[PDB]
Design a protein around this ligand. Structure first.
Ligand code: HEM
Length: 412
């Protein structure tokens, strides 16, 4: 019989999620109940999976396909059948995937690099211009960077977040504007492919209504999880000075020019390890949902019926001691020295299979470029001895994380 947490009469397990930190609560429950537990609400049921041994089965695309969780069904009210909130069987999913994938590879990443540097330089200038004893609000500045970068690299649109105190402000006029601005403009960017690319399979381009949903989808998915990653990784860096020393040394040895080239970002191997170890501990889109395509038995013991939902709790997967060793709470980038050594389906911060994160290379190239520049240009201090406090929205972020940065005075 499947483990299940405490209940609340006819509300079953629902009130367990009446908390501003539901994924953290679910991790505690998984630590209590193990690799799988049932979670019941009035009218619905799901099973939360935490072990590599079960999650590797869940990731078998012949048996399970992406499900839209509760949260995603609400997000679909405004992101529609854009890539993130479409079902795999909806015609617009594979069509858009085919149209947009060439935008997110590599020839593409070289073409985005210069506009990424545009926004990263604005970040570094902001910090160079701080006076003595002022501090940095980390998640806030990371979000200014990530929003501006997806806006510029993807849509040639400047949110100008660094010119603002309060985050950028609606959605329709913005979308309307991004489109109008482009009609009136010559780019080769994400919005280019949205407007002119044809799916080689169907021969069709995206229609107007789905183009609007994709812009909404990318503006959101294109920045919040990346802000969270950069913020957690700066937190782990300031809590682990020897790691910061190694990363800062690599940045100094590698970034020998006033601004980084694409090739130099790729050479930041140890920065790439640090980012993956942050993704291990706090994967910023921490859960994804699947449904059973047909009746099937999980782990030889848990029969599922067609349409049964499962949730992958990624932070708990990333703490599976049978895979990672006993020291899973420790921050050790050396875990990622050779990505080949990581067992299949043990590390899934970008989801799974054909429904995996389309933006993974973009996010990693942005994050590595920016952290490299941060580490080249400043020494950082955890002046408040900050206590990790993780705020949950769609994503995860270290709320109130602040540091001081002292400039190495290296020309930019
Ligand atoms: C440039 C930044 C990013 C962009 C533009 C982006 C975009 C997207 C899109 C459009 C999808 C849906 C893909 C599809 O199903 O066809 C997706 C999926 C996903 N992304 Fe990203 N993403 C970005 C960064 C990130 C980061 C930093 C993380 C995690 C640390 C992340 C984690 C995920 C996960 C876990 C999924 C699968 C979600 C699910 O299965 O329901 N993404 N992303």
């Amino acid at each position: 019989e499947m483990p299940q947490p405490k209940t609340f009469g006819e509300l079953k397990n629902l009130p367990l999620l009446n908390t501003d930190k539901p994924v953290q609560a679910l991790m505690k429950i998984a630590d209590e109940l193990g690799e799988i537990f049932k979670f019941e609400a009035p009218g619905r049921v799901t099973r939360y999976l935490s072990s590599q041994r079960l999650i590797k089965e869940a990731c078998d695309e012949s048996r399970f396909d992406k499900n839209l969780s509760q949260a995603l069904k609400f997000v679909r009210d405004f992101a529609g059948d854009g890539l993130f909130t479409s079902w795999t069987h909806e015609k617009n999913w594979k069509k858009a995937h085919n149209i947009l994938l060439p935008s997110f590879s590599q020839q593409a990443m070289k073409g985005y690099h210069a506009m990424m540097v545009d926004i990263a330089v604005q970040l570094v200038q902001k910090w160079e211009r701080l006076n003595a004893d002022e501090h940095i609000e980390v998640p806030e500045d990371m979000t200014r960077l990530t929003l501006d970068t997806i806006g510029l690299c993807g849509f040639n649109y400047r949110f100008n977040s660094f010119y603002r105190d309060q985050p950028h402000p609606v959605m329709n006029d913005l979308v309307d504007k991004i489109i109008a601005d482009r009609k009136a403009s010559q780019s080769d960017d994400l919005l280019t492919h949205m407007l002119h690319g044809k799916d080689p399979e169907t021969g069709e381009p995206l229609d107007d209504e789905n183009i609007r949903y994709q812009i909404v989808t990318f503006l959101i998915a294109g920045h919040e999880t990346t802000s969270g990653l950069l913020s957690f990784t700066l937190y782990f860096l300031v809590k682990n000075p020897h790691v910061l020393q190694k990363a800062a040394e690599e940045a100094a040895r590698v970034l020998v020019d006033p601004v980084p080239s694409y090739k130099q970002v790729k050479q930041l191997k140890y920065v790439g390890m640090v980012l993956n170890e942050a993704l291990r501990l706090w994967p910023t889109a921490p859960a994804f949902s699947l449904y059973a395509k047909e009746d099937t038995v999980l782990g030889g013991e848990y029969p599922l019926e067609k349409g049964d939902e499962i949730m992958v709790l990624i932070p708990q997967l990333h703490r599976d001691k049978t895979i990672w060793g006993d020291d899973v709470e420790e921050f050790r980038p050396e875990r990622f020295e050779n990505p080949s050594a990581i067992p299949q389906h043990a590390f899934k911060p970008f989801g799974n299979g054909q429904r995996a994160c389309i933006g993974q290379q973009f996010a990693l190239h942005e994050a590595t470029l920016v952290l490299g520049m941060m580490l080249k240009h400043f020494d950082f201090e955890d002046h408040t001895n900050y206590e990790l406090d993780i705020k949950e929205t769609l994503t995860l972020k270290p709320e109130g994380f602040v540091v001081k940065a002292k400039s190495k005075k290296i020309p930019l």
